[PDB]
Ligand SMILES: *c1c(F)c(=O)[nH]c(=O)n1[C@@H]1O[C@H](COP(=O)(O)O)[C@@H](O)[C@H]1O
C-alpha cells in the first residue's frame with residue numbers, strides 16, 4: 247500500500263537528500279520540478295524567485311548559461327533556501343569514473359559545490375556512480391540514474407532499464423532515485439522524476455515526446471514531473487507553474503487514495 | 504582489401520573533416536590522439552605544443568579546465584594549425600536534441616566555435632544527432648558516435664552497438680565515425696577511435712580497462728588510439744607519445760600488409 251511523501255521521508259533506508267525533498271514536497275504540496283532552461287542568469291534568478299513557492303526543485307543546465315558565474319549560483323542557493331527547493335544540475339554524466347569525478351567537482355562550474363542533486367547515465371557501467379560518489383558522498387549530495395529517456399528512439403529500455411535499477415539499489419548511499427518515464431523500482435525509498443511533460447499532447451521537432459501530469463504521476467506511478475518549455479515559453483510562467491503543480495499534486499493524491 | 508589512410512581520405516562518401524584528418528595521419532605517420540586530461544591551461548598548451556608533431560588529434564575535456572577561457576582555445580587552435588592536428592572535445596553529449604544543440608553552441612564554452620570534432624552517446628535516440636547537426640553542419644564540424652565504451656560494466660554492447668552504427672550510417676553528412684573498442688562498421692569512410700589504451704595490462708580503480716595499441720589497432724581493427732594517463736602521467740610525455748605513436752602506426756602498417 248502506498249505511503250505519502252511525508253511517510254516516505256521517514257523510511258529506514260531513505261537518503262538524507264531524499265528525505266529533505268520529500269518533506270518539503272509534503273509541506274508545500276508540490277511535486278513539480280522546474281526545468282529552468284534559459285540562457286540568461288537574470289531570467290534564471292527571476293524565475294527561481296517567482297516560482298520558488300510552487301516548486302520542490304529547480305533543475306539547471308549551467309552549461310547553457312551564457313553568463314554563468316559562481317556568484318550566480320550563490321544567489322540561486324539563497325533563493326532555494328528562502329523558498330525551500332532543491333537545486334538539481336541536469337548534467338547527465340556519461341563518462342568513465344575517473345573523468346566524471348573531475349567534471350562534477352572541478353572545472354569552471356564546480357557543480358558539486360552548489361547542486362543538491364545531479365544525474366548520470368548508466369551506459370558506462372557502475373564506475374560512473376563510483377567516480378561521482380567519491381566527490382558526492384563527502385559533500386552529502388545525491389544522484390539520480392537515468393533509467394529511461396523521454397525522446398524518440400531512446401535506447402534506455404528493457405535490460406538497460408533493469409541495469410539502471412540494479413545499479414541504483416547497489417549504490418543506495420548516494421543514488422536517491424531515477425530519471426524515468428514511469429515507476430521502475432518497487433522500493434519506496436527511491437524517487438522517480440519524469441521529464442517529457444506537458445498538459446497538451448505533442449513533442450518538439452528534435453525528438454522530445456510529451457505526456458501529461460495525470461498520465462505520468464497517476465497512471466505511470468512517478469513522483470515528480472520535470473517541466474521546461476510548458477512553463478518557460480508561457481506568457482505567465484507563474485500561472486503555468488501553478489497549473490502544473492496542481493495537476494501533478496492532485497494526480498498524486500488520487501493515486502494515494 | 505584494406506585501403507591506406509591516404510586512399511580513405513579520397514573516398515566518394517568521405518566527410519571533409521575525416522578527409523583532413525586522414526591526410527594528416529598519412530603525412531605525419533601518426534594515428535595517436537592525445538587525451539590531454541589536465542586541469543591547467545598552461546599544461547594543456549605546453550603539451551599541445553611539444554606533442555603536436557606526434558599526434559593526429561588532441562582531445563579535450565574543457566569542463567575540467569580550472570582556468571578555461573576562450574582565449575585559451577584560441578591559443579590551442581594556433582598550435583593545432585602550426586602542428587597539424589584536429590581538436591576533439593570529448594563532451595559525450597547525452598541529452599535530447601533541443602538541449603544538446605544549446606550545450607554545443609552556447610554557454611561559456613562555445614564548443615562548436617573551436618572543436619573540429621565532438622562525440623555523442625546514442626542512448627537518447629537520433630534526436631541527439633539531429634540537434635547537434637543543426638549547429639555542426641553550418642560550422643563544417645564532425646561528430647563521433649559512442650558505439651562501445653572501455654569501462655567495466657559498459658552497456659554499449661550488442662543491439663546498442665548496432666543501433667549506434669545504424670544511426671551513424673543514417674547521418675553521414677555529420678557523423679564521421681565512432682568511439683569504439685573495435686571496428687564496428689564495415690564502411691571505410693567511417694573512423695574508429697579507441698580509448699582505454701596503454702602499453703601494459705591493467706586498468707584504474709574506477710572501472711577503466713586497458714588494451715594495447717597492437718591489440719586495438721592490429722587485432723581489433725580500429726584506426727586511432729586515444730591515450731591519456733599512459734602519456735600524461737609519464738615523466739617524459741614526449742617520449743611516451745612517441746612510444747604510443749610508433750606502436751599504433753606499426754600496428755596499422757602490419758594490418759595493411
Ligand atoms: C533529459 C532526459 F534525460 C530526458 O529523458 N528527457 C529530457 O527532456 N531531458 C531534459 O529535461 C528537460 C525537458 O524540458 P522540456 O522538454 O519540458 O522543455 C530538458 O532540460 C532536457 O534536457
Ligand SMILES: *c1c(F)c(=O)[nH]c(=O)n1[C@@H]1O[C@H](COP(=O)(O)O)[C@@H](O)[C@H]1O
Pocket residue numbers: 341342345538540564593595649651652653654682698699700711729730731732733
Ligand atoms: C570516454 C569513453 F567514451 C570511453 O569509452 N572511454 C574513455 O576512457 N573515455 C575518455 O577517454 C579518456 C581515457 O583516458 P585514459 O584512461 O587513457 O587516461 C578519458 O578522457 C575518458 O574520459
